[PDB]
Amino acid sequence: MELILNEAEKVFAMHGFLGATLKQIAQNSNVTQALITYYYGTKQNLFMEVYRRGLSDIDKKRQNYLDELKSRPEGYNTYDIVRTYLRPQFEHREAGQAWMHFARLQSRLASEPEEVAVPLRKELYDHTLKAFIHEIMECEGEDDAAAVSWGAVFMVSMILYMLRGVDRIGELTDGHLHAESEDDIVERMTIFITGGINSLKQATQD
Amino acid sequence: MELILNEAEKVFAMHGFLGATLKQIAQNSNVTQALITYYYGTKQNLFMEVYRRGLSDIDKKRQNYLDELKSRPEGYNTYDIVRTYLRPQFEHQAWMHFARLQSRLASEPEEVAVPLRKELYDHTLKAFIHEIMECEGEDDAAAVSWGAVFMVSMILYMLRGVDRIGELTDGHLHAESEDDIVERMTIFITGGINSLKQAT
């Protein structure tokens, strides 16, 4: 059910898709390559299963948080939607091994070959991103699709980068500023994205 | 040298630092490994030279655009500074390879990435933060500094050259041009910085 996947996850996170071998994953899992192949077919499908498992929980949480929003008596807005989308990528219990590996794996996604990345994002990222765009468009004052759609692209870029867990803010401020917590990071991303979407909207026409 | 660098650039862009071999780069360049070693020392130093060359021209152009800004009788603002920082990454083969190489930077080992960004990205980013702080209405360092981090995330992603907007809109929306991309990033970042400021 799970042990091979966990090991595969670790090896992919460390070496990427190309550098990972089924040899190594079989060794680390104490099984044969043939058994891994039996269950998962190709290295590419194993990689997809690792992403399927990780993103299934994340998207389930996004859906729960979005449902919560829709049950609020006093309504919700763009800020809330963005937060909802971001939270499940950054919240964990602070130990959080399972979290780390999949965070690191996603943070490397841009370096994976397009042959695996294209079908991956088509199956596992696109639908939920389109739904997020759609939800934002249903808000009051939101009737510029370009602004929201570009906003979504830039949001993704921020997610992948922050998933690295590098203290970039600290590096750039000589240690004077740091993220306080995962929630501070989510908060700052949310505000930044919400404002950016507004400015894209505002800049089209007057 | 110039030829070896170009080949090294291509191989690093395709395979990353770890997966790249001096063997392959020597083959593609029609020289021996020993000769590459002679000129560049280690694979790590070769990698750094590829980045030094690429970022030297980029930063030189940033500096020229910033000087232009400071000579304008009517002054300049945050929007102008951000644009100035972004444009040389997106205004152009030579272009493609370095763009792709930078877009993979997050997957490189920290042993090479740490000294790399220290030597080649940090100083100019701090200078960009500083220039924005010198503008009217800008006296929130956190907002600008977070803005700069998010700007970097956007740059690396857009340097992939993937039509993500097209993928997500069933082909209904696309980047018109490199300038349209720069424009949209600039507006987004400028507004985001404002919102961070406004929220504190």
Ligand SMILES: O=C(O)CCC(=O)c1ccc(=O)[nH]c1
């Ligand atoms: O843009 C990509 O290449 C795929 C990544 C993506 O669409 C994504 C990644 C994380 C996330 O939370 N939402 C979308």
Ligand SMILES: O=C(O)CCC(=O)c1ccc(=O)[nH]c1
């Ligand atoms: O954030 C990183 O890991 C290093 C990249 C970086 O600091 C950077 C990249 C492109 C650019 O234009 N300015 C900074």
